[PDB]
Design a protein around this ligand. Structure first.
Ligand SMILES: N[C@@H](Cc1c[nH]c2ccccc12)C(=O)O
Ligand SMILES: N[C@@H](Cc1c[nH]c2ccccc12)C(=O)O
Lengths: 309, 309
C-alpha cells in the first residue's frame, strides 16, 4: 500500500501495490523509488491519464512481465513505464498502447482520484499552477524529498559535472525553470521564430526536448545497461543522437541544456569506464526529461478549443 | 550554374555553384543530386530561410569542409545540410548555427528570390498551398522526376519492402499524404487527444515525426556509413531508437509509418549485410523525413499572430 498526495489540490489517495503480475516493477517502486516527489502532468493526447517523472534510471530498462491494453484497464489502475513514469488512469483513454500495471487506487478513493485528475487537467489547460505530487509508503512521513544521486565516480572531472547537472535538475524539479518560463512569455534573447512571432518556437521547443530525453538520451542509457556494446562504441554514437537537438534548442533559449551537452560531449571521449559513461549520460538524460514535464505543463494547449471533435 | 524553379508562383532563379569552399558538397549536388524536385518549405523558426528535402542518403553523412554562421551569409546563399536540405537565405536569419555554403543565386535574381521567399511564407502561414520546387543544371530541360532508388540488394524480402516503401515515399512526394491531411482536419480514427480536442495531437504529431527522421533514423544511417560499428551492433541498437516513437504516432494516425516500422523491425535481425541494413533503414528514414515536410507545411502556424515580439 502507498499514498499519493497532490499538494495544491490537497488530495490524497491510497493504492494497493501488487507483486502478482509485475513483481520486479512492484519491488522497484516499493524498495528503490519510494518515497519521492515529482511534477504532476496530465496526458494531453492519451485521455484521462496522469503521469509524473520518477528520477531513477532503472525505470528506463526494467522489464515488465505483464502488459495490458491501457484503455481496457479499470479506472484507478497504477502503471510503471520505461518513459520513467508512474501513471494512473482516472477515466477513459484513447491510447491503446500496452502498459505495465503494478496496482490500483483503493475503491474508496476513486472519486477523490477523478476529482484530482480534473484539478490536474485544469492546471495544464488553464491556470498553469504547478502541481506537486508526493508518493510514499503508507504511513511513513517524509520531510525530505531530494532527487537520487548516482554513486560517486572515480573521476574528478566526470563527478563534478554529474553533481552540477543533478543539482540543477533538483533545483527546478518542482520549481519552474526560468529558461522554460521565459520562452513561453516571449523573453527570448535570440528572437527565435520566423517573422517576429515565437509561437512556432514553442512548438519546436515542445517538440525537440521530448524525444531528446526519452528517445535519444534514455535510449543510450537502455543500450548501455542491457547490451554489451563496447564503451568505445557508446562513446562514438553519443554525439550523433544528442548534439544537433541540444544545439538547435540552445539557440531557441535552452542555454543550460546546450551548455550541459557541450561539457558532456567535451568530457566524453576521455571517460575510462562504463560506470563513468553512464553517470555522465544519465545526468543529462534526467535533466532533459525534467524539462519535458515543464513543457507539458506550460505549453498553450488552450488553443484546442478551436480543435474539437 | 543551376536553376531553381518554384512552380506555383512562377519564379525561376539562377545560382552559381562554388567549389571554393565545399568541393565535395558542390560536386555531389552537381553530379549526384541534379535534377530533382521537392516540396518547398519555409523555416518557421530560423527567419527568412527556404529549405526543401532531397531524396539522397549521401547528404546525411557527406561532410562540409567549410561552415559559416548563416546569419552572416549574404542573401542568396545556397547551403547543403546533413538534415538532407538544400537551403537558401533570402533575408535576415536569427539562427546562428553554422551551415555549409555551396553557392549563390545570381545578383540579378535576388528580387525574384525574395518574392519566392515571401510566397512560400504565404503558403506555410495562410494558404497551405503546396509549392513544388524543381532544381536543374542550367541548360538541360527536365521532364520526369522520380525518386532515387537504392541499388537492388541481395535479399529478396528486404528488397521487396524497400521497393514498397520507396514507392510510397515517391507517391506522396509533392502530393499530400491523406494520413497527414486527415489528422490536421480532425479525421483521426482513434480520436487521439485529451478532452475531445486534437490540437495537442497535432503538436505531438509535429514534434515526434521530425526527430524520428532527422535524429534517430538519419543518425543510424550516418553511424552505418561514417563508422565501422559492426553489423551485429547496428542491428542491436536500431529498435531502441525507432520503435516507441513510431508506435505512438501509429496510434495518433500514422498507420503507414507504424506498419512500415514493424515490417522493418521484423526483417532487421535477418539482415545479412551492411548494404542490406543500410537500404532497409534508409527507405524508412526518407519516408519519415518526408512526413516531416508535410507537418511543416500543414501545422496551424497562424496561431503565431498572438505571439508577436
Ligand atoms: N501520452 C502522453 C504522451 C506520450 C505517450 N507516449 C509517448 C511516446 C512518445 C512521445 C510522447 C508520448 C500525453 O498525451 O501526454
Ligand atoms: N530551421 C528550421 C528548424 C531547424 C533548423 N535546424 C534544426 C535542427 C533540429 C530541429 C529543427 C531544426 C525551421 O525553422 O523551420
Amino acid at each position: 500500500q502507498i499514498e499519493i498526495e497532490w499538494v495544491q489540490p490537497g488530495i490524497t489517495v491510497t493504492a494497493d501495490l501488487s507483486w502478482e503480475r509485475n513483481p520486479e516493477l512492484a519491488e522497484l517502486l516499493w524498495t528503490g523509488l519510494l518515497p519521492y516527489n515529482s511534477l504532476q502532468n496530465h496526458a494531453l493526447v492519451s485521455g484521462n491519464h496522469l503521469y509524473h517523472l520518477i528520477a531513477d534510471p532503472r525505470l528506463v530498462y526494467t522489464e515488465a512481465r505483464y502488459k495490458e491494453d491501457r484503455t481496457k484497464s479499470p479506472d484507478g489502475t497504477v502503471f510503471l513505464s520505461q518513459l520513467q513514469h508512474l501513471a494512473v488512469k482516472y477515466g477513459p483513454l484513447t491510447e491503446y498502447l500496452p502498459a505495465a500495471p503494478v496496482g490500483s487506487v483503493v475503491p474508496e478513493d476513486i472519486d477523490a482520484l477523478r476529482e484530482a485528475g480534473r484539478a490536474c487537467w485544469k492546471a495544464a489547460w488553464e491556470t498553469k499552477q504547478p502541481i506537486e505530487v508526493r508518493v510514499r509508503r503508507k504511513g511513513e512521513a517524509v520531510t525530505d524529498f531530494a532527487l537520487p544521486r548516482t554513486p560517486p565516480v572515480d573521476h574528478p572531472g566526470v563527478q563534478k559535472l554529474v553533481e552540477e547537472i543533478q543539482d540543477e535538475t533538483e533545483r527546478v524539479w518542482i520549481t519552474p525553470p526560468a529558461e522554460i518560463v521565459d520562452m513561453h512569455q516571449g523573453r527570448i534573447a535570440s528572437r527565435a521564430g520566423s517573422y517576429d512571432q515565437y509561437f512556432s518556437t514553442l512548438v519546436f521547443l515542445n517538440g525537440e526536448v521530448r524525444p531528446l530525453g526519452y528517445c535519444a538520451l534514455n535510449g543510450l542509457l537502455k543500450i548501455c545497461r542491457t547490451t554489451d556494446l563496447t564503451l568505445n562504441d557508446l562513446k562514438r554514437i553519443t554525439p550523433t543522437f544528442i548534439k544537433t537537438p541540444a544545439e538547435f534548442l540552445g539557440y531557441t533559449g535552452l542555454d543550460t541544456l546546450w551548455r550541459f551537452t557541450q561539457q558532456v560531449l567535451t568530457l566524453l571521449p576521455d571517460v575510462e569506464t562504463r560506470e563513468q559513461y553512464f553517470a555522465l549520460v544519465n545526468a543529462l538524460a534526467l535533466y532533459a526529461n525534467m524539462l519535458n514535464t515543464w513543457n507539458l505543463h506550460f505549453f498553450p494547449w488552450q488553443h484546442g478549443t478551436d480543435y474539437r471533435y
